[PDB]
Write a protein that binds this ligand. Sequence first.
Ligand SMILES: CCOc1ccc(Cc2nccc3cc(OCC)c(OCC)cc23)cc1OCC
Ligand SMILES: CCOc1ccc(Cc2nccc3cc(OCC)c(OCC)cc23)cc1OCC
Ligand SMILES: [Mg+2]
Ligand SMILES: [Mg+2]
Ligand SMILES: [Zn+2]
Ligand SMILES: [Zn+2]
Lengths: 321, 326
Amino acid sequence: QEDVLAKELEDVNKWGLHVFRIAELSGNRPLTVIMHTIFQERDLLKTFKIPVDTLITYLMTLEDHYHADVAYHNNIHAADVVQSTHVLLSTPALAVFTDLEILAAIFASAIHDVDHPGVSNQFLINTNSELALMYNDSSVLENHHLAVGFKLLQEENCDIFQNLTKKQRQSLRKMVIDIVLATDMSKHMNLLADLKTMVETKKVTGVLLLDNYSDRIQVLQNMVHCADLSNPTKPLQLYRQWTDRIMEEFFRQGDRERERGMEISPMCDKHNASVEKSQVGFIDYIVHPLWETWADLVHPDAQDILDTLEDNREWYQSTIP
Amino acid sequence: TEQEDVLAKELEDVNKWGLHVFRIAELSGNRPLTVIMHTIFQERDLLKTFKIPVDTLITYLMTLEDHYHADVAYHNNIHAADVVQSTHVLLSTPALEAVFTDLEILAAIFASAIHDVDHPGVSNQFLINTNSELALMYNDSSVLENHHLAVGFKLLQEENCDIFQNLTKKQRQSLRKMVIDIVLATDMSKHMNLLADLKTMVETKKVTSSGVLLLDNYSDRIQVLQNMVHCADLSNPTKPLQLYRQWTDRIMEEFFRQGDRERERGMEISPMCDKHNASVEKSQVGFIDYIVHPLWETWADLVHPDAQDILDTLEDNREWYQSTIP
Ligand SMILES: CCOc1ccc(Cc2nccc3cc(OCC)c(OCC)cc23)cc1OCC
Ligand SMILES: CCOc1ccc(Cc2nccc3cc(OCC)c(OCC)cc23)cc1OCC
Ligand SMILES: [Mg+2]
Ligand SMILES: [Mg+2]
Ligand SMILES: [Zn+2]
Ligand SMILES: [Zn+2]
């Protein structure tokens, strides 16, 4: 078990990690064991004088604040985005980012969905939720994920940034905020349009050259956004499991919408939904346009992932009679 | 009841720039926001238009006024009533006659009332640098302005406080978005971008057959309402000098108290907050020259010449504060 886990973790730098096995192999603690192994792999514990214990105590209370009764936005999803951002950072076309910029993108991935109630922003807005009332209908979940993620650092022996300098702590906090706020799906088009102009003005050596903060944080934003939408790009046995979990969450929200008389938002109707046609449409309009633009920026480092994405699009299309 | 008759006489000037807002606060028993909002709602027939019960309106106004801190010198209920009344006058300008709907007028006035509720008397940067719970909650992004909105909307849920109870859900949805867009624009960190957009509108403004401004899209309509409440927020140097000087003494009192809290923490004292080495007169001249006059001169161009007397008072007050320096 512990040494099945040990050898499972050996592919942390591989696109297609067995995150679900690692989850059950780790006692439902995949976020803790993956974040740890990544910090040791990138040498972040020593580079930022992070006490190993304090890293454990925070990753556990951070994982506990992910809801276990939600099918998709739980600790397994947080672990999957963490590992995938870690792989996209090791892309040959980019140590383009500093050690703090790497730690910010990895830390933002771990907290990007903490305390997710399993419902969308529009649901929280239309139901007059306390969260939407607090955050004025603007990136309600993403603001909440950040607030909870930072507040847990103030708990007993969980300030993993205790020995960072004050200027590093503020620079990290600013970058983590800018990244997690970009995970709002309502900002996907603007984030992709700005990614398309970056590739239209790309300047490489061919390692890519970013000089100003607004260009580097823009790549980090699209990077974690790419890993947030990386399910259709992983192996099919992983993709299908994520599809079952996100549809189970959409149906649960659709059940809650119908028992209040609110409109059944698309892809949420129990009794009227085509899971396979929605996945093909989700790839053709969102995932593939984003991943093909990201492929052109690190051309040709993302060719394999774009191939796997096109493979799964073809397979899901074949499941449609 | 002679104090009620003096108050009713002073409330007759609510349509006029330079209302004795400090006297109204005294005559109404520290309730300027309630009586001024009630007077404006009656003046614009808002209670009948939106079926607002009078008891519900008074109950919410008192509750909203209660949540303004009485122990803060500037960002208190008097400032809220002042911004409400000054937005009310700016809405009645001739260049904007029949331009905004009753819902947009209701949104701008309501936004003015809640735009600073529960202000603790310290800036956004102070709340960010001190690792406050508010800055943690709102991730250092428009911390105060987001808090003002959340409190102003939350108080509507108290007993007999929903003044929007008879609006349609499409009306409440539209009003809520407009109020949020307006209050968020009161963040001074967005002043340069908001003024840049206002200058672009002035350079490309279109007028109608009647001579009023043509605003045929939400982006242009909300931009005018944003800058209007923003100008009302920074309206102190455009008021008669006896009112301007009182607002100056109150904001300097708030600045000095923040600098004292900045001193007791070893922090670097924010500008214009060190009560041991500060120049009140030179700061007001720089405040007018670099912020207030560029903003109000641009707004005056937008409704030329309806704001000429307001602009003349601002330039007169700038000259006076300048004359006290040599
Ligand atoms: C227009 C369609 O856009 C969207 C539609 C739905 C969503 C919702 C959404 N959020 C996060 C992850 C998601 C993963 C999913 O599949 C995993 C295999 C998924 O599968 C829909 C068929 C939808 C997902 C987000 C969208 O992004 C833009 C708002
Ligand atoms: C870009 C935004 O700039 C600024 C934003 C805020 C402030 C500080 C500030 N905040 C709110 C209200 C203020 C009212 C005042 O007086 C009324 C008579 C005032 O008087 C100068 C001391 C400063 C004020 C100062 C700024 O500019 C300094 C260069
Ligand atoms: Mg999310
Ligand atoms: Mg304010
Ligand atoms: Zn996510
Ligand atoms: Zn104000």
